[PDB]
């Protein structure tokens, strides 16, 4: 409170952005894997009590038919960002009669992030987004959108508290020839590794984007089938 | 900039308390005791005057008790200037309601609106809260006689008998001891004056140190003239 | 409390006191006296830098046709006050159809100063303003305004580090003369008086470059050129 | 203006520190007093000169607010001057322009108290460092004397004093005041009470005194409307004060 | 134009409203209900400019419902008609007035009395034993002035309404496609024939 | 340091520490080289990736076919300033049907940046820009610093280790300024300059991007296999 | 004050199977005076989109300027991605309707290739309603031009000669050269019979190869 | 112009003409007077073309935002009220609109709302709008049934538009037919009114005056 | 106006004002919710009872809000929620869903964590009800951060850790209480693990239980223990 929210550190970094990044390290893990067949998103549904209905958590959301988002950190902050993104995508379709590109949408969200100060929101968002989508120009794309208002495209990315281990495994195990089924099982493998809870269809959620049918979240039954398949195949790894 | 000088009213303490509200409440704990009692047939308001001198016009000083409309009165503890601001707002609100609906404002609607004004200053705008607690005495055809209190937080609660200001723990103890639901206004007048007499930190309770009002059955709303306070003090055996 | 115009526990406004200190930054003394139908202002001019254009160095301002102002304090705040006073006087003449009186302008500028004493976001101006005119109703008039927003009329006044020495000499002169004004019919002798008295008080002779002189008459306020001041100084040498 | 926040706040003890400090400024001010008689009100103050060269006649410590309401102050003179201007305007805009009538004393006092209260709570302002004595007459309430403090609290008085001498003055006024006091007696007592608190020199130049009294049709400035009352406010001349002091 | 009629009898208020909606050359609809229930015992019927009537009535309905939720209480028909009058009186001074004439029929369960208020688009409110807007009164008031009795039962009120409607159908040149009839009483609001 | 809390505070020596810290943002940014001849101006930028799985962040933004820039430091501020510059060029074209001079564009950025140094509540921009363009006065290169200082140069470099490239450009100025017929040799001069700022890293078709503008050469960005010629 | 005027001029869009034509006369008029004999109304807006906004020429100029600026901004924020003719049509609708209550008093036509590579023509009312059309004429002599093109391009009202009105004359491919010939003859007849129809005909032709411009002199 | 929609057991038929006119001049024969708001909602353009097209496309955008927020198809009632509120906010500004919002949801079934520039919002079984509406009503009221076949309902729509095209000079060009089902709307193609006229004139034997 | 950034990140990335708003919730009087198969039951443990009504506020005829924390802040949220419910019912043609209202209230709380010059609400809410043509009961919680989630049973305020551990022992996620009596018995048992009860049922059937009924449950529980 001594220091104004817009100030640089002597190291040339905005204090409130850095501290927002510290908030995101506390968030539950989200993992994205891009493939030529589709993008997979998976999230740790870190239920705080068994009386919590895990199906209400909804840490993966549709932004448009071919764009989805996974969030980690202060997930209440994400609802504003997602409202903006959805409005941008629909407004783009209204003004151009065409879908927004995934990159242009990610930029629209990242343009929101540093619009904080005094004399505007009071603080940065405390949430990172994995934005996955398809467009005809650049295909299946995964982006990491950060409260710095910067974004990178990623082949695969982990965010949240598990991110450093998961990302090391993504560096090991991602390759351009991964099928979507392989990406699904790799997401589940790395969630299982970095999740403290036992992975099951209630502790985790999956989704993919495919151009044939767009963004869909997988039902618990399909996810349990995939977790069974992983448990089987893990005998040979 | 100015950030250096901003005391940041409207922030939580680590315990989740609003310190300016707690400190305004402390301010009110040094104000003159006010008492409300809801009888079966009416309501008594009584208050102690803290400022006293032989040179004060007690006959024209009316600092504790105010009419809000023909059916509702307030007793004030705390900063009288802040109270006068809020009382004017409440009077306007009551008349706006009568203009809109052609009916007298329900007591709870008035109390809620004034409490919401007080709450606003605790949550936004960076201003200090109003340093006043109110007792509201009113009648309406829905609930009849109603006695409310409100404080700087904008909390409000309904009461059968209530005290605000300095000696309220003692006053509420004595009221718990002697209150009865069947009691008449003339019983409640005695209970009010006896409680003020037993709680005042002066040497003796006297008509110059008192303000007194009643709402009783239409409903009539009487602020006692000082001679009537003499009459009631002798009738109660306190003077 | 030291940094903004809020009360100290002693009820002081330290920023106002420190704004008074700023009024002596220039180390200049000014003197004003009333004649029968003129007012004269004398101010020291100190132009030590040979590269200055001395004609641009002035603390005397023509506010209107009839009002002069002399400022003690740093020239930027002086020019702020002068511009504001000029605007106020023109606006007064437009609104009300007659020339702004010197006392009315002094009141208005003092009220602006009070605002700076009361609102935290504006600092006081570090200037003392002495307004002079021959008023249509009050005759020759000296009104002096300060950073507190105080103003009063004066028989005569001085301002600056040596204002006590000049003031006590003026007071002794009025004790010697038993009058509220300089008894002379024409302003040249009032100028010569004021210069002689500043010399006697400060203990220093003046060249025509060491002074600036303002004269208010019924028709106009005007400032003397250096050669008119020469004529007055040689008159003093010969009278 | 970035000072949108309150500069007056509650301390942990519940004090509004800036208001107590404004009251300290008042208590260091030059003594002012008021006395209500059956048939008038006196308000009086010392005029302390800032210089022997100052024309104290040019500084009005007693001000007409309405033809029947006068004020005096102790404390910060400039704050008083600005409050007088605001009181005059609000007496017009909040009342005379609506009802065709000057406000009663109590309602104008309420309006002044409101202005003072807002300086204790609105953003970026300190309280006014003045206490006012406001004397007036109105047809229904008669003569009134009120004190308004920096908080905007106000109290009706039979007699009171404010400023540095107010304790001794209030004790003397408690000795001297009574319900049968006529305005000439109130003026005499006022002059006595100031004599005991002036810094030596005590005369019609060092004293400012005004009364609320009878209507003064000679001050009205026109004739032919029998219902138009002359002003009840009247500042005494220095010669009237001297004449009374010689007989004191 | 639309017909709205009201009769306050001893125990109840009867409101009758025409079913036609006409745009230009054609009858679009023959079944339109020109009323909104404001509260369980208060009904408002409306007539006037297309669009204005329903926008106004739904705004009123939402505000009365909000009041009822906030207070957990039902406003009297008096208070409702005062509120509606205030909204109409504002609209006359607004940049686009609601051209809407209303009848408010309610049963005051505190008084146990039926109440019928007529409010014109100006905000002229009048409590009446029976009421109408526009030309419907020109044909019906002589029947009501002749036959109306304050102690009428609901059934007598309905028969008198039938006579008024028959007279309108005879002499009024428009075809208004009959009326919907609502009854407001101590049991609430019901629709009748 | 009590004086670094805001832009509106001078230190006792007249420094503006928040501005200096925003320049440290630039010094942490990856190197960009600019250089020009009389006929052509070139930008060369080393992009950085977040990790082996990430893309390389865009360092170069086209304003117009006559103008574009390269950024070092806080990329969202570069987006803001690039949009503003695009608006100014657009306004000049719409209202006067004239191509905005590069010098005037630079002064417009200077003025926009200065406001954030002078008033409370904002902050300085955290980004340095190299602006190249071609106009009626020929090729231009500007360096923008978020102090609001804009300087016209034949060559410069900004970002980390950029003093090595700047030293090389200082050493070779009298050669590269003459390269008027041959944009590819000016590009190669710029790529050799930026090589002097590389530490434990090599230029690749992934991390290198180039832009050029000139007499009949609309502002064009080369990236990917388009730069393999110049590596 | 009337903020509008009529500058005459006539324009014609024809979509071919693999080309589009947008043609306009070049005369600018005010009442019975010629302002200019060669003030072109048909513009290449980039992305192989051609546009003409016939009517009040100040509003037409303003709309074309704003559309070109929208194209530039689309390039800036889509990495010089080509704007589709369909997206351009939607954007032009939004440009026009933003002035709904003080409209651009122009009939606009744009022409280009769709993403299949077929000729596309879109026509817009002053307020921004728009339709993809095979052909549209606009302006003063549209009524003189289009019925003849309906007859010669679409064989409207023409039946197969031996069938006594049973069988339509079958539609067939017109080359761009045949279309240009029909356009020239239509504008020549309009020049004969409409006093506003200009001194010259400028034809923009859009193909996969880009935009090409042809000019033909008209009478006067 | 002529537009109609009617409810039946198969859902909704929407039938429209394609004529546009400017005075006596036929500006186009091929105007699309149905706006495909989304795969489940249709609107009919009969006012000013620009107002209907623009605001019903925007309505489609609002439906999509509602679906994203609420995870459900928007109601036809909700869509028509969104449109009628928008149009009422511009009342007196001079919007020119007269549209049937047609849709079929599980909660509502097949639903038509007439919406007007004046802010009228009417639910109904049958609406005809435009200069030919009285002729279309004349056929439709003579021949409508709820139990009508889908093919019979499409024929009835086509014949009502044809009747308007014969009698109303400002109606004609071609007939566009739509069938709204719970699964969405089905386009049943374009029918040139001249071909249709001479077909019906021979097959049905009507228009004996011609 | 006043725009001070009151809610800001600490170096460890916490927002202290939201944590302290949660401390205000934790000091606040309890609220308990238990969702059954066909009802949701809400409960709580010289005042005039008539004009100190239930803490359980109707937002609309089908949906009900309880809260813990600052009562005055809760009045602001309740009024906003009621206004939004009526607005949705007006501008669209249906009453709000319970999740729509919950999301609106959580959005209001979130916005006051990220807006200049405002304190976060020191309030947590339980939102219970039925969607207008649905009979799946709903029970949502909102928090000062603007997080919201659905619960089978939940408690907020003073004793809520202990009561939640009790509900976790005694609520069966695969055999939820089958009748109103079972829901009420579980709610009362949880509140006695340390009375006012509202039952919410479909079709706007919201009923506060009589004290004599509650005392029947209380005495039965005290007889079975």
Curated annotation (Swiss-Prot), chain B:
Present with 17100 molecules/cell in log phase SD medium. The 26S proteasome consists of a 20S proteasome core and two 19S regulatory subunits. The 20S proteasome core is composed of 28 subunits that are arranged in four stacked rings, resulting in a barrel-shaped structure. The two end rings are each formed by seven alpha subunits, and the two central rings are each formed by seven beta subunits. The catalytic chamber with the active sites is on the inside of the barrel. Pfam families: Proteasome, Proteasome_A_N. GO terms for cellular component: cytosol; nucleus; proteasome complex; proteasome core complex, alpha-subunit complex; proteasome storage granule. InterPro entries: Ntn_hydrolases_N, Proteasome_alpha, Proteasome_alpha-type, Proteasome_asu_N, Proteasome_bsu_CS, Proteasome_sua/b. It is found in: Cytoplasm; Nucleus. The keyword Cytoplasm applies. Keywords: Cytoplasm, Isopeptide bond, Nucleus, Proteasome, Ubl conjugation. The proteasome degrades poly-ubiquitinated proteins in the cytoplasm and in the nucleus. It is essential for the regulated turnover of proteins and for the removal of misfolded proteins. The proteasome is a multicatalytic proteinase complex that is characterized by its ability to cleave peptides with Arg, Phe, Tyr, Leu, and Glu adjacent to the leaving group at neutral or slightly basic pH. It has an ATP-dependent proteolytic activity.
Swiss-Prot record, chain F:
It holds the Pfam family Proteasome. The keyword Translocase does not apply. It is found in: Cytoplasm; Nucleus. GO terms for cellular component: nucleus; proteasome complex; proteasome core complex, alpha-subunit complex; proteasome storage granule. The proteasome degrades poly-ubiquitinated proteins in the cytoplasm and in the nucleus. It is essential for the regulated turnover of proteins and for the removal of misfolded proteins. The proteasome is a multicatalytic proteinase complex that is characterized by its ability to cleave peptides with Arg, Phe, Tyr, Leu, and Glu adjacent to the leaving group at neutral or slightly basic pH. It has an ATP-dependent proteolytic activity. The 26S proteasome consists of a 20S proteasome core and two 19S regulatory subunits. The 20S proteasome core is composed of 28 subunits that are arranged in four stacked rings, resulting in a barrel-shaped structure. The two end rings are each formed by seven alpha subunits, and the two central rings are each formed by seven beta subunits. The catalytic chamber with the active sites is on the inside of the barrel. This is Proteasome subunit alpha type-6. It comes from Saccharomyces cerevisiae (strain ATCC 204508 / S288c). The lineage of its organism: Eukaryota, Fungi, Dikarya, Ascomycota, Saccharomycotina.
Curated annotation (Swiss-Prot), chain G:
It is found in: Cytoplasm; Nucleus. InterPro entries: Ntn_hydrolases_N, Proteasome_bsu_CS, Proteasome_sua/b, Proteasome_suB-type. It holds the Pfam family Proteasome. Its main location: cytoplasm. One of its GO terms (cellular component) is nucleus. Transmembrane segments: none annotated. GO terms for biological process: proteasomal ubiquitin-independent protein catabolic process; proteasome-mediated ubiquitin-dependent protein catabolic process. Keywords: Cytoplasm, Nucleus, Proteasome. Coiled coil: none annotated. The 26S proteasome consists of a 20S proteasome core and two 19S regulatory subunits. The 20S proteasome core is composed of 28 subunits that are arranged in four stacked rings, resulting in a barrel-shaped structure. The two end rings are each formed by seven alpha subunits, and the two central rings are each formed by seven beta subunits. The catalytic chamber with the active sites is on the inside of the barrel. Non-catalytic component of the proteasome which degrades poly-ubiquitinated proteins in the cytoplasm and in the nucleus. It is essential for the regulated turnover of proteins and for the removal of misfolded proteins. The proteasome is a multicatalytic proteinase complex that is characterized by its ability to cleave peptides with Arg, Phe, Tyr, Leu, and Glu adjacent to the leaving group at neutral or slightly basic pH. It has an ATP-dependent proteolytic activity. This is Proteasome subunit beta type-6.
Swiss-Prot record, chain H:
Keywords: Cytoplasm, Hydrolase, Nucleus, Protease, Proteasome, Threonine protease, Zymogen. It catalyses: Cleavage of peptide bonds with very broad specificity. It is found in: Cytoplasm; Nucleus. One of its GO terms (molecular function) is endopeptidase activity. GO terms for cellular component: cytosol; nucleus; peroxisome; proteasome complex; proteasome core complex, beta-subunit complex. The active site is at 1 (nucleophile). It comes from the Eukaryota. Bortezomib binds at residue 49. Belongs to the peptidase T1B family. The 26S proteasome consists of a 20S proteasome core and two 19S regulatory subunits. The 20S proteasome core is composed of 28 subunits that are arranged in four stacked rings, resulting in a barrel-shaped structure. The two end rings are each formed by seven alpha subunits, and the two central rings are each formed by seven beta subunits. The catalytic chamber with the active sites is on the inside of the barrel. The side chain of Thr-1 acts as a nucleophile, and the N-terminal amino group acts as a proton acceptor. Present with 8530 molecules/cell in log phase SD medium. This is Proteasome subunit beta type-5. It comes from Saccharomyces cerevisiae (strain ATCC 204508 / S288c) (Baker's yeast). The gene is PRE2. The chain holds residues 76 to 285 of 287 of the full protein.
């Amino acid at each position: 409170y001594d220091r104004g929210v817009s100030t640089f550190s002597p190291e040339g970094r905005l204090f409130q952005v850095e501290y927002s990044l510290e908030a995101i390290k506390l968030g539950s893990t989200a993992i994205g894997i891009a493939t030529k067949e589709g993008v997979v998103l998976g999230v740790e549904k870190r239920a705080t009590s068994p009386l919590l209905e895990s199906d209400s958590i909804e840490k993966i959301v549709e932004i448009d038919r071919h764009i989805g988002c996974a969030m980690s950190g202060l997930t209440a902050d994400a609802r504003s960002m997602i409202e903006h993104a959805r409005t941008a995508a629909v407004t783009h379709n209204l003004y151009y009669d065409e879908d927004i590109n995934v990159e242009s949408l990610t930029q629209s969200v990242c343009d929101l992030a540093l619009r904080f100060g005094e004399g505007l929101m009071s603080r940065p968002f405390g949430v990172a987004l994995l934005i996955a989508g398809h467009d005809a120009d650049d295909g299946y794309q995964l982006f990491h959108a950060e409260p710095s208002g910067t974004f990178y495209r990623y082949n695969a990315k982990a965010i949240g508290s598990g991110s450093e281990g998961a990302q090391a495994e993504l560096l090991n195990e991602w390759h351009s020839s991964l099928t979507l089924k392989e990406a699904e099982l790799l997401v589940l493998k790395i969630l299982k590794q970095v999740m403290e809870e036992k992975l099951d269809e209630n502790n985790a959620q999956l989704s993919c984007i495919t151009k044939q049918d767009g963004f869909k979240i997988y039902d618990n039954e399909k996810t349990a089938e995939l977790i069974k398949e992983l448990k089987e195949k893990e005998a040979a790894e | 900039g100015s950030r250096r000088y901003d005391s940041r009213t409207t922030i939580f303490s680590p315990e989740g308390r609003l310190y300016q509200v707690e400190y305004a409440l402390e301010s009110i704990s040094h104000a003159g005791t006010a008492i409300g009692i809801m009888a079966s047939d009416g309501i008594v308001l009584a208050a102690e005057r803290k400022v006293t001198s032989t040179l004060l016009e007690q006959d024209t000083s009316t600092e504790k008790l105010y009419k809000l409309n023909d059916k509702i009165a307030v007793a004030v503890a705390g900063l009288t200037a802040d109270a006068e601001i809020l009382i004017n707002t409440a009077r306007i609100h009551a008349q706006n309601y009568l203009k809109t609906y052609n009916e007298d404002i329900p007591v709870e609607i008035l109390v809620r609106r004034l409490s919401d004004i007080k709450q606003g200053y605790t949550q936004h705008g960076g201003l200090r809260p109003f340093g006043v607690s109110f007792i509201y005495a009113g009648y309406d055809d829905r609930y009849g006689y109603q006695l409310y209190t409100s404080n700087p937080s904008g909390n409000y609660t309904g009461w059968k008998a209530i005290s605000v200001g300095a000696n309220t723990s003692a006053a509420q103890t004595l009221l718990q001891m002697d209150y009865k639901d069947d009691m008449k206004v003339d019983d409640a007048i005695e209970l009010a004056l006896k409680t003020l007499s037993k709680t005042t930190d002066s040497s003796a309770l006297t008509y110059d140190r008192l303000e007194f009002a009643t709402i009783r059955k239409e409903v009539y709303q009487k602020i006692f003239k000082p001679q009537e306070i003499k009459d009631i003090l002798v009738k109660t055996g306190i003077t | 409390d030291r940094h903004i115009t809020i009360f100290s526990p002693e009820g002081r406004l330290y920023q106002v006191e420190y704004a008074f200190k700023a009024t002596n930054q220039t180390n200049i003394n000014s003197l004003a006296v009333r004649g029968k139908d003129c007012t004269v202002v004398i101010s020291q001019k100190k132009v030590p830098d040979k590269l200055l254009d001395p004609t641009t160095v002035s603390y005397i301002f023509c506010i209107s046709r009839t009002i002069g102002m002399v400022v003690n304090g740093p020239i930027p705040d002086a020019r702020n006050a002068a511009l504001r006073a000029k605007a106020e006087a023109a606006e007064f003449r437009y609104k009300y159809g007659y020339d702004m009186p010197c006392d009315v302008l002094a009141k208005r500028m003092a009220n602006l100063s009070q605002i700076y004493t009361q609102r935290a976001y504006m600092r006081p101006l570090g200037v003392i303003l002495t307004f002079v005119s021959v008023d249509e109703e009050l005759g020759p008039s000296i009104y002096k305004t300060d950073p507190a927003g105080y103003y009063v009329g004066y028989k005569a006044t001085a301002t600056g580090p040596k204002q006590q020495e000049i003031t006590t000499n003026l007071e002794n002169h009025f004790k010697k003369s038993k009058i509220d004004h300089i008894n002379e019919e024409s302003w040249e002798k009032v100028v010569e008086f004021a210069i002689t008295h500043m010399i006697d008080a400060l203990g220093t002779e003046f060249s025509k470059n060491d002074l600036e002189v303002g004269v208010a008459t019924k028709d106009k306020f005007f400032t003397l050129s250096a050669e008119n001041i020469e004529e007055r100084l040689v008159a003093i040498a010969e009278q | 203006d970035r000072y949108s926040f309150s500069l007056t706040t509650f301390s942990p003890s519940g004090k509004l520190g800036q208001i107590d400090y404004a009251l300290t400024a008042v208590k260091q001010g030059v003594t002012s007093l008021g006395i209500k008689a059956t048939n008038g009100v006196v308000i009086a103050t010392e005029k302390k000169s800032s210089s022997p060269l100052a024309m104290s006649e040019t500084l009005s410590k007693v001000s007409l607010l309405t033809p029947d309401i006068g004020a005096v102050y102790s404390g910060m003179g400039p704050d008083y001057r600005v409050l007088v201007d605001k009181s005059r305007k609000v007496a017009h805009t909040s009342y005379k322009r609506i009802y065709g009538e000057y406000p009663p004393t109590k309602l104008l006092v309420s309006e002044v108290a409101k202005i003072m209260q807002e300086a204790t709570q609105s953003g970026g302002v300190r309280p006014f460092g003045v206490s006012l004595l406001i004397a007036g007459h109105d047809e229904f309430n008669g003569f009134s004397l009120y004190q308004v403090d920096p908080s905007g609290s106000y109290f009706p008085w039979k007699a009171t004093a404010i400023g540095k001498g107010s304790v001794a003055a209030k004790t003397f006024l408690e000795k001297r005041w009574n319900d049968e006091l006529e305005l000439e007696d109130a003026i005499h007592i006022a002059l006595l009470t100031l004599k005991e608190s002036v810094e030596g020199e005590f005369n019609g130049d060092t004293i400012e005194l005004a009364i609320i009294g009878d209507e003064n049709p000679d001050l009205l400035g026109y004739t032919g409307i029998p219902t138009d009352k002359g002003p009840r406010f009247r500042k005494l001349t220095s010669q009237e004060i001297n004449d009374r002091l010689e007989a004191l | 134009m639309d017909i709205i009629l009201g009769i306050r009898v001893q125990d109840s208020v009867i409101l009758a409203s025409s079913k036609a909606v006409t745009r230009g050359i054609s009858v679009l609809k023959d079944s339109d209900d020109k009323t909104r229930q404001l509260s369980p015992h208060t009904l408002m019927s409306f007539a006037g400019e297309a669009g204005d009537t329903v926008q106004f009535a739904e705004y009123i309905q939402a505000n009365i419902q909000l009041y009822s939720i906030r207070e957990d209480y039902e406003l009297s028909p008096q208070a409702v008609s005062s509120f509606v009058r205030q909204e109409l009186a504002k609209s006359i001074r607004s940049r686009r007035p609601y051209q809407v004439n209303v009848l408010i029929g309610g049963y005051d369960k505190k008084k146990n009395k039926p109440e019928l208020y007529q409010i014109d688009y100006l905000g002229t409110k009048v409590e009446l034993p029976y009421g109408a807007h526009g030309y419907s009164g020109f044909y019906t008031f002589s029947l009501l002035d002749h036959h109306y009795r304050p102690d009428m039962t609901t059934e007598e009120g309905l028969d008198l309404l039938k006579l008024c409607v028959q007279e309108l159908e005879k002499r009024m040149p428009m075809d208004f496609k009959g009326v919907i009839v609502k009854i407001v009483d101590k049991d609430g609001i019901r629709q009748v024939d | 340091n009590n004086y670094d809390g805001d832009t509106v505070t001078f230190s006792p020596t007249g420094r503006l520490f928040q501005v200096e810290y925003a320049l440290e943002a630039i010094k942490q940014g990856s190197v960009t080289v600019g250089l020009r001849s009389n006929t052509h101006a070139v930008l060369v930028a080393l992009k950085r990736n977040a990790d082996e799985l990430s893309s390389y962040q865009k360092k170069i933004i086209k304003c117009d076919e006559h103008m574009g820039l390269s950024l070092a430091g806080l990329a969202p501020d570069a987006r803001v300033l690039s949009n503003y510059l695009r608006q100014q060029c657009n306004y000049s074209s719409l209202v006067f049907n004239r191509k905005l001079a590069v010098e005037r564009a630079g002064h417009l950025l200077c003025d926009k940046a200065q406001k954030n140094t002078q008033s409370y509540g904002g902050r300085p921009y955290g980004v340095g820009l190299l602006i190249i363009g071609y106009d009626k006065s020929g090729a231009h290169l500007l360096e923008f610093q978020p102090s609001g200082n804009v300087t016209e140069l034949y060559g410069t470099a900004i970002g980390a280790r950029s003093q090595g490239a700047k030293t090389y450009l200082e050493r070779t100025l009298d050669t590269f300024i003459k390269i008027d017929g041959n944009p590819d040799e000016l590009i190669k001069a710029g790529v050799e300059a930026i090589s002097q700022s590389l530490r434990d890293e090599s230029l690749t078709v992934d991390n290198l991007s180039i832009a050029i503008v000139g007499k009949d050469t609309p502002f064009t960005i080369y990236d990917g296999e388009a730069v393999a010629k110049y590596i | 004050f009337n903020p509008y005027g009529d500058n005459g001029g006539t324009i014609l869009g024809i979509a071919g199977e693999d080309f589009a034509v947008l043609a306009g006369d070049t005369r600018n008029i005010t009442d019975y005076s010629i302002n200019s004999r060669y003030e072109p109304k048909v513009f290449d807006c980039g992305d192989n989109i051609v546009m003409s906004a016939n009517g009040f020429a100040a509003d037409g100029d303003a709309l074309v300027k704003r559309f070109k600026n929208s194209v530039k901004w689309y390039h800036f924020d889509h990495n010089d991605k080509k704007l589709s003719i369909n997206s351009a049509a939607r954007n032009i609708q939004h440009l026009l309707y933003g002035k709904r209550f003080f409209p651009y008093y122009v009939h606009t036509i744009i022409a280009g290739l769709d993403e299949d590579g077929k000729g596309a023509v879109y026509s817009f009312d002053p307020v921004g309603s728009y339709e993809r059309e095979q052909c549209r004429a606009g302006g003063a002599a549209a009524s003189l031009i289009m019925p003849f093109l309906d007859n010669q391009v679409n064989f409207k009202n023409q039946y197969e000669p031996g069938t006594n009105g049973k069988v339509k004359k079958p539609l067939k491919y017109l080359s761009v050269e045949e279309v240009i010939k029909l356009v020239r003859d239509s504008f020549t007849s309009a020049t004969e019979r409409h006093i506003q129809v200009g001194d010259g005909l400028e034809i923009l032709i859009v193909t996969k190869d880009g935009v090409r411009k042809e000019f033909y002199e008209l009478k006067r | 112009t002529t537009t109609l929609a009617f409810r039946f057991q198969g859902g909704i038929i929407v039938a429209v003409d394609s004529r546009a006119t400017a005075g006596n001049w036929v500006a186009s024969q091929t105007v699309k007077k149905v706006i495909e708001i989304n795969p489940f909602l249709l609107g009919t353009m009969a006012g000013g073309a620009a107002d209907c097209q623009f605001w019903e496309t925007w309505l489609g955008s609002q439906c999509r935002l509602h679906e994203l927020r609420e995870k459900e198809r928007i109601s036809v009632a909700a869509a028509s009220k969104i449109l009628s509120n928008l149009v009422y906010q511009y009342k007196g500004a001079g919007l020119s609109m007269g549209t049937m919002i047609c849709g079929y949801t599980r909660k509502e079934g097949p639903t038509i709302y007439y919406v007007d520039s004046d802010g009228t919002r009417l639910k109904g079984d049958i609406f005809c709008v435009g200069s030919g509406q009285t002729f279309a009503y004349g056929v439709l009221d003579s021949n409508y049934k709820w139990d009508l076949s889908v093919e019979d309902a499409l024929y009835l729509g086509k014949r009502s538009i044809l009747a308007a095209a014969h009698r109303d000079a400002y109606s004609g060009g071609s007939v566009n037919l739509y069938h709204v089902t719970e699964d969405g709307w089905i386009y049943h193609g374009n029918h040139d009114v001249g071909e249709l006229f001479w077909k019906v004139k021979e097959e049905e034997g009507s228009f004996n005056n011609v | 106006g006043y725009d001070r950034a009151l809610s800001i990140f600490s170096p460890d990335g916490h927002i202290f004002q939201v944590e302290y708003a949660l401390e205000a919730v934790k000091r606040g009087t309890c609220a308990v919710g238990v969702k059954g198969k066909n009802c949701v039951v809400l409960g709580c443990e010289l005042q005039d009872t008539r004009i100190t009504p239930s803490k359980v506020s109707k937002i609309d005829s089908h949906v009900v809000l309880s809260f813990s924390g600052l009562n005055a802040d809760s009045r602001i949220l309740i009024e906003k929620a009621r206004v939004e419910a009526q607005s949705h019912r007006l501008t669209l043609e249906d009453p709000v869903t319970v999740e729509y209202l919950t999301r609106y209230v959580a959005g209001v709380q979130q916005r006051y964590t990220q807006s200049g010059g405002v304190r976060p609400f020191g309030v947590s809410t339980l939102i219970a009800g039925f969607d207008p043509r649905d009979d799946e009961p709903k029970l949502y919680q909102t928090e000062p951060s603007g997080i919201y989630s659905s619960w089978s049973a939940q408690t907020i305020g003073r004793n809520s850790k202990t009561v939640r551990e009790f509900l976790e022992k005694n609520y069966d996620r695969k055999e939820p209480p089958a009748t109103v009596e079972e829901c009420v018995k579980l709610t009362v048992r949880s509140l006695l693990e340390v009375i006012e009860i509202t039952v919410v049922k479909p079709d706007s059937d919201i009923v506060a239980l009589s004290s004599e009924e509650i005392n029947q449950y209380v005495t039965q529980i005290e007889q079975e223990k």
